[PDB]
Amino acid sequence: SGPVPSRARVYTDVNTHRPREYWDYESHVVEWGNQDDYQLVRKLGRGKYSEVFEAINITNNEKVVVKILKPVKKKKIKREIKILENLRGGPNIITLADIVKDPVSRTPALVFEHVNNTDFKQLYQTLTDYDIRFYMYEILKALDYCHSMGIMHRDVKPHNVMIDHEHRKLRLIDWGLAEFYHPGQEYNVRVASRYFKGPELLVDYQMYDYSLDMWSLGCMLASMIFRKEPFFHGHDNYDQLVRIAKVLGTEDLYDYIDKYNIELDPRFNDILGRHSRKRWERFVHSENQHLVSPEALDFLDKLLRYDHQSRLTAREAMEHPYFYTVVKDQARM
Ligand SMILES: Brc1ccc(Br)c2[nH]nnc12
Ligand SMILES: Brc1ccc(Br)c2[nH]nnc12
Ligand SMILES: [Cl-]
Ligand code: NA
């Protein structure tokens, strides 16, 4: 028999209740602007799918970020545009300002309202306890928002969090792997960066949901409170599940496999072995103990579960005692 079907615990049917045109990005008609409205100033970065530049809008002299898309399926480009348009104005979501083509090359580009190219990866191994809680809460605002809008990011990692530490402002960027959640849809498991991949991706369980982002968030949290980058340090996608199994234990892994009737790749048969579930105290030492509290460990434990349905939702996470002082200070301000 096949894998047991799965549904999101929250925001299950939000796209069903929308007009077709909200989520049917293949049918979306883009009005392409003129990249000659922008002059590129300098290169910020370069991923697999894009080169990113600081630029000037010559019309209003405003600084913007231009993301030149490396050639790719028209389908992926419409998906990213539609998701960015749907989420525009959401808390801690990057703002799409324009969609343009170079008049000569006809290469498509996305124009975003300016953010500094200071990613969380550059800052997140040097934060105070309070600032980890503060920025984690800001990321949760973006995730609860996109999940509530029927979208999963699928590439949550420190590089995709841009932070202005001076102004205590955060933006979740790079929506190029994001998808719409539809109940019963089987998704591509070749998403996310190795160290942040949820167990569903690693065992090829395709009927996943928003909870994938909550695993990635747990990987980030573990890295930061333990000063261990990355927390799960696999050599490849097979060894990645072994690194998880040595922490979360094999009993819960095989119970998860059984629960969803997952057909485990035979490569796993000799490498997973037999491992106890480790107490988090095992990762605490003199250099990180100031970042680790009962609150932090209780919260982390409820993000890093094999069973995607078990993980906290973004809103449940925001309700956790770990954030009580952040929530109190926000109200005060
Ligand atoms: Br690097 C970098 C900086 C700002 C934005 Br907005 C980005 N989007 N993708 N990569 C980005
Ligand atoms: Br990095 C970064 C993040 C969020 C905001 Br809002 C920013 N404004 N300038 N630079 C920013
Ligand atoms: Cl990263
Ligand atoms: Na401590």
Swiss-Prot record:
Organism superkingdom: Eukaryota
Ranges for region Interaction with beta subunit: 35-40
InterPro entries xref list: CK2_alpha (IPR045216), Kinase-like_dom_sf (IPR011009), Prot_kinase_dom (IPR000719), Protein_kinase_ATP_BS (IPR017441), Ser/Thr_kinase_AS (IPR008271)
Main location: nucleus
Enzyme Commission designation: 2.7.11.1
Activity regulation as described: Constitutively active protein kinase whose activity is not directly affected by phosphorylation. Seems to be regulated by level of expression and localization.
Free-text description of this protein's post-translational modifications in UniProt: Phosphorylation does not directly affect casein kinase 2 activity, but may contribute to its regulation by forming binding sites for interacting proteins and/or targeting it to different compartments.
SMART domains in the cross-refs: S_TKc
GO molecular function, one term: ATP binding
Domain Protein kinase: 38-323
Compartments it resides in: Nucleus
Disulfide bridge map: none
Keywords, ordered alphabetically: Apoptosis, ATP-binding, Biological rhythms, Cell cycle, Disease variant, Intellectual disability, Kinase, Nucleotide-binding, Nucleus, Phosphoprotein, Serine/threonine-protein kinase, Transcription, Transcription regulation, Transferase, Wnt signaling pathway
Biological processes annotated in GO: apoptotic process; chaperone-mediated protein folding; DNA damage response; double-strand break repair; negative regulation of apoptotic signaling pathway; negative regulation of double-strand break repair via homologous recombination; negative regulation of proteasomal ubiquitin-dependent protein catabolic process; negative regulation of signal transduction by p53 class mediator
Active site: 155
Gene Ontology cellular component list: cytosol; nucleoplasm; nucleus; plasma membrane; PML body; protein kinase CK2 complex; Sin3-type complex
Pfam families (alphabetical): Pkinase (PF00069)
Catalytic activities: L-seryl-[protein] + ATP = O-phospho-L-seryl-[protein] + ADP + H(+); L-threonyl-[protein] + ATP = O-phospho-L-threonyl-[protein] + ADP + H(+)
Homology family: Belongs to the protein kinase superfamily. Ser/Thr protein kinase family. CK2 subfamily.
Function: Catalytic subunit of a constitutively active serine/threonine-protein kinase complex that phosphorylates a large number of substrates containing acidic residues C-terminal to the phosphorylated serine or threonine. Regulates numerous cellular processes, such as cell cycle progression, apoptosis and transcription, as well as viral infection. May act as a regulatory node which integrates and coordinates numerous signals leading to an appropriate cellular response.
PANTHER family: CASEIN KINASE II SUBUNIT ALPHA (PTHR24054), CASEIN KINASE II SUBUNIT ALPHA-RELATED (PTHR24054:SF16)
Known partners and oligomeric status: Heterotetramer composed of two catalytic subunits (alpha chain and/or alpha' chain) and two regulatory subunits (beta chains). The tetramer can exist as a combination of 2 alpha/2 beta, 2 alpha'/2 beta or 1 alpha/1 alpha'/2 beta subunits. Also part of a CK2-SPT16-SSRP1 complex composed of SSRP1, SUPT16H, CSNK2A1, CSNK2A2 and CSNK2B, which forms following UV irradiation. Interacts with RNPS1. Interacts with SNAI1. Interacts with PML (isoform PML-12). Interacts with CCAR2. Interacts with HIRIP3.
Misc note: Can use both ATP and GTP as phosphoryl donors. Phosphorylation by casein kinase 2 has been estimated to represent up to one quarter of the eukaryotic phosphoproteome. Casein kinase 2 has been found to be increased at protein level and up-regulated at the level of enzyme activity in the majority of cancers. However, elevated levels of casein kinase 2 are present in certain normal organs such as brain and testes.
Protein name: Casein kinase II subunit alpha
Species per Swiss-Prot/TrEMBL record: Homo sapiens
